[PDB]
Design a protein around this nucleic acid. Structure first.
Ligand SMILES: [Zn+2]
Ligand SMILES: [Zn+2]
Lengths: 357, 357
DNA sequence: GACTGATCTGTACATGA
DNA sequence: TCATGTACAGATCAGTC
DNA sequence: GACTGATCTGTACATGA
DNA sequence: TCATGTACAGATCAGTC
């Protein structure tokens, strides 16, 4: 039933091999340039994130997320209002001439300036690539990335995400977040929150004050770890352990939403991170690996489905790391959208999921 | 029944507090001196091991194990025969004048010279302690340590173990060892074997060739990790998880052996590491946390007990990290001892464990 | 500007209810 | 079984050369 | 003598039986 | 469901300034 859908969604190792070849080449060139010519993004490091690197990419390997993170010492964050997600970045110490002085709009590190220079460098190096059909995509509003289109005959999109790495303790807005204590445990959560955190440009085009100096938190590293260490049992999905159907449900849900989005313009507010967040909450709700046995696929997928609908009905999907940040607020998504989606989803749920063809 | 015995074996937080106070003071002074006066053990670091730091110490806090580990780059090991446990230590690179040149008997690092200088320094600093009654114990044959007796009114013994730290990949004799793949998992084992390993002086007084240049492997770091991360479930014994009776069975077994040893001279070959190794094998055999529920204490303790007897009957207790190394060989322990122990143990097992009074 | 001691956060354990 | 206090452990921050 | 590229081991995943 | 081959990831070692 659903197993056949999962077969359809499976990536093919040939496609994977070629796409990965080309992609790795381009990425390596860009990183190296970002170090080489006496840049100010020298010292940047690489961190692969997203569905492809979590092995939850569906249909095709045509989307890649790569973080160019740069450690930026001695900073102080001023929370942008009480959003929990958004911050203004200040420095204690302008070191001397300082790489990042040119990226200052006061005491405040400007996300848009930094992003513009980043973009300029990337375009420059991309012009010098003669053996691969790679180009720079026009800037998308609300993106912290420079998106590359690769004609590896087939089209592949690569988000090169500019990030700031901070080894300090996580902002307060996350203190109640990451509620894995009953699922992955206390030692795990403690070790994860000991890790650095990351800030990417918000790059909203709304016309606000502090619009180009607003940064958003990112936890793609931690999400990667969770996707790859997802059981209560350490042997879950391991070589000497047993498979769950967690990743599978994430894939099915992702696909459902992708299709429902390609057919309806009413769902342009929705992205797969909503699905991911919701499923994090579900995995925290049903921690037991037994509650995610393959033989219970259909029911498991329904459980999640049910949960999601409730999130729409209550208009309440809390951010998994920032509990005060609601993702289904009226400010971000209109009621009408959520209701429309509840309708379509319910239909599909009561009709044997016709859309899966 | 056994719960009351575990109550008797429990340490008391006052005793713990005082003993720990004094002990930490002395240890800090010794480490600092080991760094300060222009030594050759400068750069040494501390690593607390053993029952006290695993929270499996029984009766009293009168025994402490502390490793002074020193990273020793660019070495090559020659396995002492096919023992798997014993090695001769050679250098690729005599760096220049080199700290450790004085500890060389050729190309071979001498364990006894190093241990002698270590001991000399420790005695020197111990003379300078005026506020605490601390002395150096006479060297024990087969010890890689300098043992301190502290009259903190009550007597406390502290083994200061000289160790060498190597970040290279683990010797081949351990390749089949650490068989946690079904219990803690594959990722765990892989990450643990990526860690450094340690060599302590064998310090046998047997009169062999290469007697004072023979080193023994140590895995007290890994054993510490296992004791503190002992479940298949990450929440085992955690604040938002459930208790097992693993540590409890280790304690009971430890105590049984301690008593049976204090009463009988026939069991001077036996140490608690045999108990620890056996229980590692049992935890690998019964990985499920459900197989270690508190309510199944008595039976669990019996299971272990049974296992141990079999190890004596077969005269086969493999080292947990070095599978080729047998601990119940005739070379190390006489049959008569193992049989005697089987007898006493069986008696206790069939008689409601009178010895526990 | 770089190295060492001081401070802070949280887990495991004892204790009291 | 559930709340309160101590040790241990690791990490970050503040102070000295 | 210090920094970067090359080599090696193992987990997760696709494929074939 | 179980054996074979590819990507990804981290670590150590060898080669260049
Ligand atoms: Zn799983
Ligand atoms: Zn446990």
């Amino acid at each position: 039933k659903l197993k056949k859908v999962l077969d359809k969604l499976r990536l093919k190792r040939k496609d994977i091999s070629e796409a990965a070849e080309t992609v790795n080449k381009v990425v390596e060139r860009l990183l190296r340039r970002m170090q080489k010519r006496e840049s100010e993004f020298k010292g940047v490091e690489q961190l692969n994130t997203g569905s492809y690197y979590e092995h939850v990419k569906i249909s095709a390997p045509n989307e890649f997320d790569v973080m160019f993170k740069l450690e930026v010492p001695r900073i102080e964050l001023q929370e942008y209002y009480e959003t929990g997600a958004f911050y203004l970045v200040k420095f204690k110490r302008i070191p001397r001439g300082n790489p990042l002085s040119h990226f200052l709009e006061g005491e405040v590190l400007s996300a848009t300036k930094m992003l513009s220079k980043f973009r300029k460098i990337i375009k420059e190096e991309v012009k010098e690539i003669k053996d691969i059909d790679v180009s720079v995509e026009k800037e998308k509003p609300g993106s912290p990335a420079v998106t590359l289109l690769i004609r590896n005959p087939e089209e592949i999109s690569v988000d090169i995400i500019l990030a700031l790495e901070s080894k300090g303790s996580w902002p307060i807005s996350t203190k109640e977040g990451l509620p894995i204590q009953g699922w992955l445990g206390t030692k795990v959560r403690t070790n994860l929150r000991r890790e650095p955190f990351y800030l990417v440009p918000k790059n909203a085009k709304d016309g606000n004050s502090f619009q180009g100096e607003t940064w958003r938190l990112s936890f793609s590293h931690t999400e990667k770890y969770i996707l790859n260490n997802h059981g209560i049992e350490k042997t879950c999905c391991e070589s000497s352990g047993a498979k769950c159907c967690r990743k599978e449900c994430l894939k099915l849900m992702k696909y459902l939403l992708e299709q429902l989005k390609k057919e309806f313009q009413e769902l342009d507010a929705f992205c797969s991170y909503h699905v991911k967040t919701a499923i994090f909450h579900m995995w925290t709700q049903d921690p037991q690996d037994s509650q995610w046995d393959p033989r219970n696929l259909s029911s498991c997928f329904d459980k999640l489905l049910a949960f999601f609908l409730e999130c729409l009905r209550t208009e309440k999907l809390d951010h998994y790391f920032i509990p005060k940040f609601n993702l289904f607020s009226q400010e971000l998504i209109d009621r009408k959208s959520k209701e429309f989606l509840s309708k379509k989803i319910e239909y599909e749920r009561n009709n044997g999921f016709p859309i899966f063809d």
